[PDB]
């Protein structure tokens, strides 16, 4: 029941995802690893402890390096894995940039809207891709050679569910979405007309509605099970929740950067509030090829 | 009791051990660690694998912050992966031996020997004195060498507490730990091993034998005077039999080490001299370390 235009839209998004999502993370290299006023600290300390994870490094030889984080006592212990997660987030975003560049509807947009759209959807597209490698039964993001396993807590599943980011990943994983529905979610999140700095509001909004219409159609043709009733509205609701979480963790990120500077050059540009001159790295990447 | 000379003999060995055995391994730094991520050569390569599967351990590096890095060894895949922890264990050995060289130099009986005999004694006893020191930090309840922040936990070979006992090196450590020796008895074992008159290259065989006999008499007298007489009636002979077994183990692992060096060169310069890879001109590093 999909139109030819809609079939073409899903083919280009699926092709772009394949060409720009390093699911095995085999090209993620040269990352930092953990080495072998007062009220602001208390808020920040709660932020980081909510997402405590152990890092696992699998080698082609079969070896495994495992990092267990220190317990939450004293200060500057919570910042152990932050530099590594900053290097990982930066790598994920460079793939997000390449994802948008392949899309024809995005490439033809003005360079300032391209910068503004990626600046506003970076975290959201990054979390959507993390969800496709998230293992809900083990609480682990399986990123090829690297694995990020959630540390146990005293409250357990119920206490972790109080963290919105963690709750987003479990709820979205339970929808059992297809690759096409994720990539259409990524497109809908990317082409948001109400992002700060967008000038072609009407052009981006038209693009967004068509991506959403194509998602609604795809679900109607391939998801006749009763478990998938209202799946389109559920997905659209999850996308609205992710936008809310992005704001929370944009301010968390800025608090944590102030107390302790952990950001890469590209992440600092994304959080800097001439667009091209302020984002020189992002402008260069958008101009480069694949 | 013991003669005052035997008492001074123990006082000097304990003083030597105190100044040269870094029990916490705090000064063991800048070591290498495993990385983040033909027809008869096939024979020699086949022997090396068997040698490296006998003693499989996982490395734990505990941090000041409370973090725990842990390395699990790869299973054999017929490649360089089998030589993953050898660069680290070559830095560990070199670090331990330099403490052994320092141990012998503080002992007065060892300094008065000819330098060529000092080199010969250190060559034959370095593996034995290193394993004797390792046993004092070996926990048999968990199969782990507790080297300060570093831990080396033996891996379960599916026949744990039975398959590991086949390897004479592991059997040596479990058996020696069961004797529950004192610090003075450990240091006397080291002296008996160091002053072995039958090591290759020794020329003052009569002098070194006399010395070994007097350390052994001190050890026997120490056990008679400082332990319940009937229960430890044969503790001295048990210790001498463990030292005899360690000499046999030494010969076996000296060959293992030389075969592995032939295929994959991992040794440090000081270790290369120790394994033969004029005595003073063939061991110039060890010679300088003794002069200083
Ligand atoms: C395995 C991924 C899933 C889990 C998530 C719970 O990972 C972690 C696990 C643990 C930790 C701790 C640091 C240990 C608390 C953090 C993280 N996670 C991040 O550190 C992150 N996740 N996304 N981002 C991010 C990415 C981009 C492009 C961006 O551009 C505006 C802004 C961003 O943050 C505002 C970022 C920076
Ligand atoms: C805390 C110690 C760890 C455990 C404890 C037994 O051991 C291993 C456990 C595992 C491994 C593997 C590498 C994983 C196979 C090796 C080793 N062990 C060595 O790599 C060693 N242990 N001692 N030596 C050594 C030292 C000296 C001065 C020497 O001078 C002639 C000759 C030597 O070997 C011929 C050496 C070279």
From Swiss-Prot, chain A:
- What is the purpose of this protein? Nuclear receptor that binds and is activated by variety of endogenous and xenobiotic compounds. Transcription factor that activates the transcription of multiple genes involved in the metabolism and secretion of potentially harmful xenobiotics, drugs and endogenous compounds. Activated by the antibiotic rifampicin and various plant metabolites, such as hyperforin, guggulipid, colupulone, and isoflavones. Response to specific ligands is species-specific. Activated by naturally occurring steroids, such as pregnenolone and progesterone.
Domain NR LBD stretches: 5-273
Section of the entire sequence shown:
142 to 431 of 434
Identification of the protein by name: Nuclear receptor subfamily 1 group I member 2
Q: Name one GO cellular component term.
A: chromatin
Q: Which gene encodes it?
A: NR1I2
Q: Quaternary structure?
A: Heterodimer with RXR. Interacts with NCOA1. Interacts (via domain NR LBD) with CRY1 and CRY2 in a ligand-dependent manner.
Where in the cell is the protein located? Answer: Nucleus
Similarity comment: family membership: Belongs to the nuclear hormone receptor family. NR1 subfamily.
Principal localization? nucleus
């Amino acid at each position: 029941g999909l139109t030819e235009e809609q079939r073409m839209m899903i083919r280009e998004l699926m092709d772009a995802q394949m060409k720009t999502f390093d699911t095995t993370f085999s090209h993620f290299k040269n990352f930092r690893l953990p080495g072998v006023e007062a009220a602001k600290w208390s808020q920040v300390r709660k932020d980081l402890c909510s997402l405590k994870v152990s890092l696992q490094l699998r080698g082609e030889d079969g070896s495994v390096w495992n990092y267990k984080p220190p317990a939450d006592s004293g200060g500057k212990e919570i910042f152990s894995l932050l530099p590594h997660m900053a290097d990982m987030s930066t790598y994920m975003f460079k793939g997000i940039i390449s994802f948008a560049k392949v899309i024809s509807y995005f490439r033809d947009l003005p360079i300032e809207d391209q910068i503004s759209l990626l600046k506003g959807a970076a975290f959201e597209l990054c979390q959507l891709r993390f969800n496709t490698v998230f293992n809900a039964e083990t609480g682990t993001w399986e990123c090829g050679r690297l694995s990020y396993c959630l540390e146990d807590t005293a409250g357990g599943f119920q206490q972790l569910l109080l963290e919105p980011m963690l709750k987003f990943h479990y709820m979205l994983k339970k929808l059992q979405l297809h690759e096409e529905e994720y990539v259409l979610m990524q497109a809908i999140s990317l082409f948001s007309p109400d992002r700060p700095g967008v000038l072609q509001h009407r052009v981006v909004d038209q693009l967004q509605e068509q991506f959403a219409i194509t998602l609604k159609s795809y679900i109607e043709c391939n998801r006749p099970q009763p478990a998938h009733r209202f799946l389109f509205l559920k997905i659209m609701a999850m996308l609205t929740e992710l936008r809310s979480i992005n704001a929370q963790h944009t301010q968390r990120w800025l608090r944590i950067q102030d107390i302790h500077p952990f950001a890469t050059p590209l992440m600092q540009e994304l959080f800097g509030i001439s667009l091209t001159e302020r984002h020189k790295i992002l402008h260069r990447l958008l101009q480069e090829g694949s």
